[PDB]
Amino acid sequence: ARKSTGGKAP
Amino acid sequence: SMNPPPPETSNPNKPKRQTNQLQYLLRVVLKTLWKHQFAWPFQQPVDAVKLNLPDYYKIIKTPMDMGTIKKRLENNYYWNAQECIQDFNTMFTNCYIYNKPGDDIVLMAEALEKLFLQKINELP
């Protein structure tokens, strides 16, 4: 998902 | 809390060769995955600090990513194709281990894996 979270959730 | 060192991609004490199948792992299999629009989570070792994943390296003891694999192939680090294939398998398993079944990253990972398998079926 998000670039900021490496595509990881929460 | 700290990241571990990344996997080795080079070693002068390991003998070297180029094979048709390793060329294919680089320029067909890795090339296809690397350019896919879902590659980006997998293109580099997981940065636990920067990503604030403090449990990642408690849970994942055998980390692997496509950054490392590409490097390994470029560095003639593998002697046998299955060594490389094993690294891909490890990358995909880790994803399934750490992430929840419903997470979008798991669906990215399975999409890449299907492509991977389809390519391995045509190895020379």
XYZ file of N, CA and C in Angstrom:
402
model
N 0.818 -1.242 0.000
C 0.000 0.000 0.000
C 0.843 1.279 0.000
N 1.253 1.778 1.175
C 1.942 3.078 1.251
C 3.470 2.929 1.100
N 4.057 3.840 0.336
C 5.507 3.914 0.150
C 6.244 4.152 1.423
N 5.673 5.003 2.273
C 6.242 5.322 3.591
C 6.375 4.128 4.513
N 5.473 3.131 4.397
C 5.460 1.928 5.277
C 5.999 0.644 4.589
N 6.707 0.816 3.473
C 7.228 -0.326 2.712
C 6.157 -1.269 2.180
N 4.942 -0.742 2.030
C 3.735 -1.507 1.705
C 3.124 -2.365 2.808
N 3.664 -2.239 4.023
C 3.206 -2.970 5.209
C 2.002 -2.274 5.758
N 1.132 -3.055 6.389
C -0.080 -2.452 7.007
C 0.232 -1.970 8.470
N -0.750 -1.416 9.220
C -0.388 -0.539 10.344
C 0.981 0.154 10.334
N 15.817 -3.493 17.735
C 15.757 -2.098 17.269
C 16.743 -1.752 16.172
N 17.836 -2.461 15.960
C 18.737 -2.051 14.850
C 18.444 -2.956 13.672
N 18.740 -2.512 12.445
C 18.700 -3.438 11.318
C 19.897 -4.361 11.310
N 19.694 -5.593 10.975
C 20.856 -6.410 10.695
C 21.632 -5.997 9.432
N 22.912 -6.430 9.290
C 23.559 -6.251 7.989
C 22.797 -6.945 6.880
N 22.823 -6.394 5.649
C 22.092 -7.045 4.589
C 22.727 -8.364 4.158
N 22.035 -9.200 3.351
C 22.680 -10.476 2.982
C 23.907 -10.223 2.158
N 24.862 -11.094 2.257
C 25.998 -11.112 1.372
C 25.593 -11.142 -0.066
N 26.273 -10.333 -0.927
C 26.054 -10.464 -2.345
C 27.292 -10.850 -3.129
N 28.431 -10.974 -2.432
C 29.725 -11.191 -3.029
C 30.612 -12.038 -2.122
N 31.428 -12.913 -2.723
C 32.398 -13.598 -1.950
C 33.455 -14.190 -2.883
N 34.729 -13.668 -2.879
C 35.899 -14.245 -3.645
C 36.417 -15.664 -3.384
N 35.990 -16.289 -2.260
C 36.212 -17.730 -1.842
C 35.196 -18.790 -2.309
N 34.406 -18.406 -3.321
C 33.321 -19.264 -3.875
C 33.572 -19.329 -5.346
N 33.643 -20.563 -5.914
C 34.055 -20.463 -7.313
C 32.869 -19.970 -8.189
N 33.089 -19.674 -9.452
C 32.092 -18.962 -10.269
C 31.929 -19.531 -11.628
N 30.688 -19.464 -12.108
C 30.411 -19.747 -13.481
C 29.123 -19.083 -13.957
N 28.997 -19.088 -15.277
C 27.813 -18.551 -15.910
C 27.177 -19.753 -16.559
N 25.883 -19.858 -16.445
C 25.208 -20.930 -17.095
C 24.035 -20.269 -17.849
N 23.532 -20.938 -18.866
C 22.278 -20.507 -19.518
C 21.122 -20.302 -18.516
N 20.996 -21.191 -17.558
C 19.904 -21.026 -16.629
C 20.016 -19.865 -15.673
N 21.218 -19.586 -15.185
C 21.431 -18.398 -14.418
C 21.210 -17.120 -15.276
N 21.630 -17.120 -16.550
C 21.373 -15.971 -17.418
C 19.902 -15.675 -17.554
N 19.111 -16.742 -17.601
C 17.723 -16.705 -17.698
C 17.068 -16.249 -16.458
N 17.574 -16.692 -15.312
C 17.109 -16.192 -13.988
C 17.300 -14.676 -13.906
N 18.427 -14.147 -14.420
C 18.667 -12.677 -14.440
C 17.848 -11.898 -15.450
N 17.937 -12.316 -16.700
C 17.419 -11.446 -17.785
C 15.999 -11.761 -18.181
N 15.432 -12.875 -17.685
C 14.072 -13.193 -17.859
C 13.298 -13.096 -16.554
N 13.671 -13.885 -15.558
C 12.826 -14.057 -14.354
C 12.895 -12.838 -13.437
N 14.120 -12.402 -13.067
C 14.311 -11.207 -12.287
C 13.914 -9.968 -13.070
N 14.266 -9.915 -14.336
C 13.837 -8.773 -15.113
C 12.277 -8.621 -15.062
N 11.550 -9.736 -15.205
C 10.080 -9.581 -15.308
C 9.516 -9.072 -13.997
N 10.114 -9.548 -12.917
C 9.518 -9.270 -11.568
C 9.900 -7.802 -11.192
N 11.207 -7.526 -11.356
C 11.758 -6.235 -11.036
C 10.934 -5.104 -11.697
N 10.501 -5.300 -12.953
C 9.735 -4.225 -13.684
C 8.209 -4.146 -13.480
N 7.679 -5.062 -12.690
C 6.291 -5.196 -12.436
C 5.908 -4.075 -11.515
N 4.687 -3.583 -11.636
C 4.279 -2.398 -10.814
C 4.179 -2.622 -9.272
N 4.013 -3.884 -8.847
C 4.167 -4.373 -7.460
C 5.543 -4.793 -7.011
N 6.617 -4.489 -7.720
C 7.926 -4.885 -7.171
C 8.522 -4.108 -5.971
N 8.187 -2.815 -5.871
C 8.809 -1.876 -4.978
C 8.941 -2.272 -3.488
N 7.937 -2.931 -2.877
C 8.155 -3.447 -1.489
C 9.312 -4.463 -1.351
N 9.707 -5.084 -2.490
C 10.610 -6.186 -2.499
C 11.906 -5.845 -3.162
N 12.094 -4.584 -3.572
C 13.245 -4.297 -4.316
C 14.558 -4.053 -3.428
N 14.516 -4.177 -2.134
C 15.615 -3.824 -1.185
C 15.329 -4.499 0.117
N 16.370 -4.805 0.909
C 16.070 -5.337 2.214
C 15.114 -4.490 3.038
N 14.298 -5.178 3.815
C 13.440 -4.471 4.705
C 14.183 -3.566 5.758
N 13.850 -2.268 5.759
C 14.506 -1.311 6.661
C 13.583 -1.167 7.877
N 13.826 -2.045 8.853
C 12.981 -2.089 10.054
C 12.922 -0.771 10.856
N 14.043 -0.117 10.935
C 14.116 1.159 11.648
C 13.272 2.188 10.969
N 13.544 2.388 9.674
C 12.938 3.477 8.893
C 11.454 3.214 8.745
N 11.090 1.957 8.577
C 9.712 1.575 8.466
C 9.008 1.383 9.830
N 9.722 1.533 10.950
C 9.220 1.286 12.345
C 8.575 -0.101 12.497
N 9.227 -1.110 11.956
C 8.838 -2.498 12.188
C 9.694 -3.198 13.226
N 9.387 -3.019 14.544
C 10.424 -3.504 15.464
C 10.453 -5.012 15.623
N 9.372 -5.690 15.202
C 9.219 -7.134 15.358
C 9.805 -7.877 14.121
N 10.190 -7.108 13.086
C 10.435 -7.763 11.768
C 11.546 -8.791 11.891
N 12.739 -8.366 12.401
C 13.872 -9.253 12.554
C 13.918 -10.137 13.796
N 12.934 -10.025 14.711
C 12.593 -11.083 15.646
C 11.900 -12.253 14.938
N 11.079 -11.956 13.942
C 10.207 -12.897 13.290
C 10.949 -13.485 12.066
N 11.552 -12.628 11.254
C 12.272 -13.034 10.033
C 13.753 -13.181 10.305
N 14.241 -14.436 10.318
C 15.640 -14.765 10.487
C 16.426 -15.021 9.239
N 15.769 -15.216 8.088
C 16.386 -15.499 6.807
C 15.900 -14.444 5.768
N 16.354 -13.186 5.899
C 15.714 -12.130 5.037
C 16.256 -12.237 3.717
N 15.428 -11.816 2.726
C 15.827 -11.883 1.321
C 14.903 -10.973 0.519
N 15.458 -10.408 -0.535
C 14.765 -9.418 -1.291
C 15.316 -9.534 -2.699
N 14.677 -8.798 -3.606
C 15.064 -8.829 -5.014
C 16.346 -8.046 -5.367
N 16.604 -6.931 -4.639
C 17.891 -6.204 -4.546
C 19.146 -7.046 -4.326
N 19.067 -7.859 -3.282
C 20.063 -8.933 -3.016
C 20.164 -9.945 -4.154
N 19.032 -10.501 -4.631
C 19.053 -11.478 -5.699
C 19.685 -10.929 -7.005
N 19.298 -9.700 -7.416
C 19.815 -9.133 -8.566
C 21.390 -8.994 -8.464
N 21.797 -8.348 -7.364
C 23.199 -8.341 -6.988
C 23.878 -9.708 -7.019
N 23.335 -10.648 -6.270
C 23.899 -12.032 -6.401
C 24.098 -12.542 -7.832
N 23.068 -12.463 -8.667
C 23.166 -12.851 -10.092
C 24.228 -12.058 -10.856
N 24.263 -10.753 -10.599
C 25.262 -9.866 -11.256
C 26.725 -10.133 -10.818
N 26.886 -10.693 -9.629
C 28.145 -10.921 -8.972
C 28.557 -12.373 -9.188
N 27.835 -13.097 -10.055
C 28.048 -14.588 -10.157
C 28.164 -15.310 -8.805
N 27.266 -14.935 -7.884
C 27.296 -15.516 -6.567
C 26.743 -16.920 -6.494
N 25.862 -17.233 -7.430
C 25.249 -18.592 -7.481
C 26.008 -19.463 -8.460
N 26.206 -20.714 -8.005
C 26.695 -21.755 -8.889
C 25.538 -22.467 -9.590
N 24.505 -22.859 -8.821
C 23.317 -23.630 -9.303
C 22.102 -22.700 -9.394
N 21.297 -22.795 -10.468
C 19.981 -22.186 -10.487
C 19.091 -22.349 -9.234
N 18.999 -23.525 -8.664
C 18.115 -23.726 -7.458
C 18.509 -22.885 -6.286
N 19.778 -22.520 -6.154
C 20.192 -21.566 -5.119
C 19.388 -20.247 -5.248
N 19.263 -19.804 -6.477
C 18.589 -18.540 -6.775
C 17.152 -18.633 -6.624
N 16.634 -19.757 -7.060
C 15.207 -20.058 -6.923
C 14.775 -20.118 -5.456
N 15.621 -20.674 -4.635
C 15.473 -20.727 -3.187
C 15.405 -19.342 -2.585
N 16.279 -18.476 -2.967
C 16.158 -17.100 -2.539
C 14.841 -16.451 -2.889
N 14.370 -16.602 -4.122
C 13.002 -16.106 -4.456
C 11.971 -16.716 -3.532
N 12.028 -18.039 -3.377
C 11.031 -18.691 -2.485
C 11.086 -18.130 -1.079
N 12.295 -17.881 -0.558
C 12.446 -17.349 0.788
C 11.808 -15.983 0.870
N 12.044 -15.178 -0.140
C 11.441 -13.762 -0.198
C 9.930 -13.793 -0.108
N 9.324 -14.643 -0.938
C 7.872 -14.780 -0.911
C 7.401 -15.368 0.474
N 8.021 -16.407 0.967
C 7.591 -17.037 2.324
C 7.636 -16.039 3.451
N 8.729 -15.233 3.498
C 8.870 -14.238 4.565
C 7.712 -13.282 4.604
N 7.320 -12.884 3.377
C 6.152 -11.984 3.212
C 4.887 -12.585 3.823
N 4.638 -13.816 3.469
C 3.520 -14.532 4.094
C 3.596 -14.820 5.582
N 4.810 -14.929 6.079
C 5.000 -15.122 7.439
C 4.705 -13.868 8.264
N 5.191 -12.733 7.846
C 5.199 -11.547 8.637
C 3.882 -10.766 8.528
N 3.337 -10.769 7.333
C 2.148 -10.015 7.051
C 0.914 -10.745 7.256
N -0.189 -10.020 7.569
C -1.476 -10.662 7.678
C -2.048 -11.139 6.312
N -2.748 -12.240 6.310
C -3.401 -12.769 5.157
C -4.187 -11.763 4.372
N -4.929 -10.876 5.027
C -5.657 -9.830 4.299
C -4.931 -8.597 3.790
N -3.627 -8.498 4.044
C -2.882 -7.277 3.759
C -2.578 -7.093 2.240
N -2.584 -5.873 1.793
C -2.408 -5.723 0.345
C -1.016 -6.275 -0.113
N -0.014 -6.178 0.755
C 1.333 -6.680 0.457
C 1.326 -8.177 0.133
N 0.437 -8.910 0.762
C 0.330 -10.385 0.497
C -0.208 -10.674 -0.906
N -1.143 -9.880 -1.292
C -1.701 -9.959 -2.626
C -0.713 -9.491 -3.688
N 0.100 -8.496 -3.397
C 1.220 -8.087 -4.284
C 2.240 -9.264 -4.465
N 2.620 -9.802 -3.288
C 3.541 -10.938 -3.211
C 2.987 -12.112 -4.005
N 1.673 -12.378 -3.975
C 1.166 -13.645 -4.663
C 1.100 -13.432 -6.136
N 0.777 -12.195 -6.502
C 0.791 -11.773 -7.938
C 2.235 -11.957 -8.527
N 3.272 -11.474 -7.792
C 4.631 -11.668 -8.232
C 5.083 -13.159 -8.308
N 4.738 -13.919 -7.252
C 4.943 -15.358 -7.201
C 4.324 -16.090 -8.364
N 3.063 -15.875 -8.660
C 2.498 -16.523 -9.910
C 3.285 -16.256 -11.173
N 3.691 -15.012 -11.351
C 4.559 -14.701 -12.464
C 5.863 -15.429 -12.402
N 6.457 -15.485 -11.220
C 7.665 -16.199 -11.009
C 7.590 -17.649 -11.365
N 6.527 -18.305 -10.925
C 6.352 -19.705 -11.233
C 6.185 -19.984 -12.712
N 5.508 -19.056 -13.409
C 5.147 -19.176 -14.844
C 6.491 -19.089 -15.581
N 7.376 -18.192 -15.135
C 8.691 -18.090 -15.754
C 9.600 -19.254 -15.509
N 9.571 -19.794 -14.270
C 10.427 -20.965 -13.945
C 10.028 -22.179 -14.738
N 8.784 -22.232 -15.188
C 8.318 -23.375 -15.967
C 8.987 -23.386 -17.354
N 9.483 -22.236 -17.813
C 10.197 -22.145 -19.081
C 11.695 -22.047 -18.930
N 12.284 -22.434 -17.797
C 13.719 -22.402 -17.677
C 14.376 -23.326 -18.739
N 15.461 -22.879 -19.419
C 16.236 -23.628 -20.478
C 16.976 -24.893 -20.023
